[PDB]
Amino acid sequence: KNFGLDVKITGESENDRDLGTAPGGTLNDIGIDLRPWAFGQWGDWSAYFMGQAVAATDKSYLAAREFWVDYAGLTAYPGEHLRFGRQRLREDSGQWQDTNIEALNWSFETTLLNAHAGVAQRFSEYRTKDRTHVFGDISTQWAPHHRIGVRIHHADDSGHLRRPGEEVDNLDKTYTGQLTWLGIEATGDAYNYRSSMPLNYWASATWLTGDRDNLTTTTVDDRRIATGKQSGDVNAFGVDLGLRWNIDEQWKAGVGYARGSGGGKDGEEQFQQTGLESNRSNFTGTRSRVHRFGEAFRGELSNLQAATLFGSWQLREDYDASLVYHKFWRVDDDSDIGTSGINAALQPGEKDIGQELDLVVTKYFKQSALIRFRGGLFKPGDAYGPGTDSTMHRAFVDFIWRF
Ligand SMILES: CCCCCCC/C=C\CCCCCC(=O)OC[C@@H](O)CO
Ligand SMILES: CCCCCCC/C=C\CCCCCC(=O)OC[C@@H](O)CO
Ligand SMILES: CCCCCCCCCCCC[N+](C)(C)[O-]
Ligand SMILES: CCCCCCCCCCCC[N+](C)(C)[O-]
Ligand SMILES: CCCCCCCCCCCC[N+](C)(C)[O-]
Ligand SMILES: CCCCCCCCCCCC[N+](C)(C)[O-]
Ligand SMILES: CCCCCCCCCCCC[N+](C)(C)[O-]
Ligand SMILES: CCCCCCCCCCCC[N+](C)(C)[O-]
Ligand SMILES: [Ca+2]
Ligand code: NA
Ligand code: NA
């Protein structure tokens, strides 16, 4: 299989990203994502290319999603390889990195020890100032399916931010500086959708230090507008804890707790994620990756506390369903929260961000095809005040064909 084609037909429904407090924030659009790919393997050499042709109801583009060359001949370890090019950098939680980026990444994956060491930097986004990311991890499977690892991420950004009044696109920097994340992780089939254990867990504690400049934004008629900048020394903490009960081979239910520290005049104790994260994982124990902090809220571990309750059902490799409840609060009731899904203004003094009920339902067909519903229903809390819509939703219907 030197080539193939993924055809994703998606329908997104977004109402309303600003909770009905600003013009914009709505979507009811369809799109086609055509991802031709080319994989070649000549011994220890392996080259891959994935293209992307997207047309949505406007947003019409072409991109080189992945383009890498890989060398596996440094060591006899079949899990050891050096990947160079625009590659997928993903760790199981999606909380450090889950993105396609030009990187020089070294993997060493053995049953007892896992180790990664890479450098990533965007030179383009290959669609129709910069940041250096330096990272590494070392984990040990101390007991079957039980892991304990330390993870490091450094972001070097000598760049600058959009000035107050200017608009901020998604391709823009929201932060600069020198930031080191040092995390301690322990997992027991944390993201294993087919687990041999009645209990799965994840437990992560991360320390963020450094110098950081970061944007403070607002929304002005569907446009993200820079309102200023926080310039400080960072000393922040992030935590994610979860327990998943595998009631049986189909039924799962679990609890989660995460906290991304918040606060400080210039965000001294405000935790943040690397900016390479997707926050998508199989934390509900299904094949379907669910947004860890709601499909609607799209929380980013930054001045955020999240309590999660989830129920899931996986039928063989045919069906999966995940019902996810989250309650969101800020740590500091005068700081902004990390969210990629809600841009509505927050009323100072109010900790209660909201509540969310997510449903992810997928039907798989070997017919190489899947029909997925990923939807978040967010109930705005007191932090967003009165006048807001009683609820917000983001729902997607994906129809994927893999050839
Ligand atoms: C083009 C409009 C944007 C799409 C918004 C999503 C529509 C939301 C709800 C209505 C459809 C409900 C059924 C979803 C579906 O077909 O997937 C479920 C299926 O995979 C397994 O039962
Ligand atoms: C050998 C034992 C392994 C455990 C070592 C891993 C834990 C190390 C450090 C935890 C980071 C805590 C940082 C303490 C801190 O908040 O100091 C900042 C303070 O000066 C400002 O309030
Ligand atoms: C920019 C380098 C990575 C992109 C290359 C895409 C992988 C295919 C390599 C071309 C050779 C194919 N083959 C096997 C037919 O010889
Ligand atoms: C060994 C060198 C391999 C050369 C193959 C080059 C493949 C890249 C294809 C460019 C496609 C870019 N885009 C954006 C138009 O899709
Ligand atoms: C064996 C190559 C992998 C190296 C990856 C780096 C792992 C992170 C360890 C950071 C060191 C911090 N400290 C204070 C714990 O020593
Ligand atoms: C061995 C790595 C796992 C460490 C995770 C445990 C973190 C401590 C839990 C307390 C959470 C409370 N708080 C307020 C600090 O967020
Ligand atoms: C809210 C998420 C946590 C729910 C998990 C509750 C534990 C499983 C209860 C089922 C126990 C019955 N049993 C023994 C037949 O398995
Ligand atoms: C025009 C399309 C409208 C899409 C409506 C879908 C709302 C998202 C539902 C999230 C799941 C929560 N639940 C269980 C209450 O349905
Ligand atoms: Ca609106
Ligand atoms: Na190797
Ligand atoms: Na599971």
Residue numbers in the entry: 40 to 96, 122 to 192, 202 to 440, 455 to 490
Quote the passages of the study that discuss this structure, keeping the authors' original sentences:
Here, a method for presenting crystals of soluble and membrane proteins growing in the lipid cubic or sponge phase for in situ diffraction data collection at cryogenic temperatures is introduced. The method is a variant on the recently introduced in meso in situ serial crystallography (IMISX) method that enables crystallo­graphic measurements at cryogenic temperatures where crystal lifetimes are enormously enhanced whilst reducing protein consumption dramatically. The new approach has been used to generate high-resolution crystal structures of a G-protein-coupled receptor, α-helical and β-barrel transporters and an enzyme as model integral membrane proteins. Insulin and lysozyme were used as test soluble proteins.
The first protein used for this purpose was AlgE, an alginate transporter that resides in the outer membrane of P. aeruginosa. Because the crystal used for data collection was long (150 µm), it was possible to collect all of the required data from four separate locations on the one crystal in the IMISX well. 20–30° of data were combined from the four sites to give a total of 100° of data. The crystals, which belonged to space group P212121, diffracted to 2.4 Å resolution with a completeness of 90.8%, a CC1/2 of 0.62 and an 〈I/σ(I)〉 of 1.45 in the highest resolution shell. The corresponding electron-density map was of high quality and the model was similar (backbone r.m.s.d. of 0.599 Å over 403 residues) to that obtained using crystals harvested from IMISX plates with data collected at 100 K, where the resolution was 2.9 Å. The data-quality and refinement statistics were comparable between IMISXcryo data and the previously published IMISX data obtained from 175 crystals at RT. Dimannuronate, a surrogate for the alginate polysaccharide transported by AlgE, was included with the protein during crystallogenesis. The expectation was that it would bind in the electrostatic pore midway across the β-barrel through which alginate is proposed to pass en route to the extracellular space. However, density for two MES buffer molecules was clearly visible.
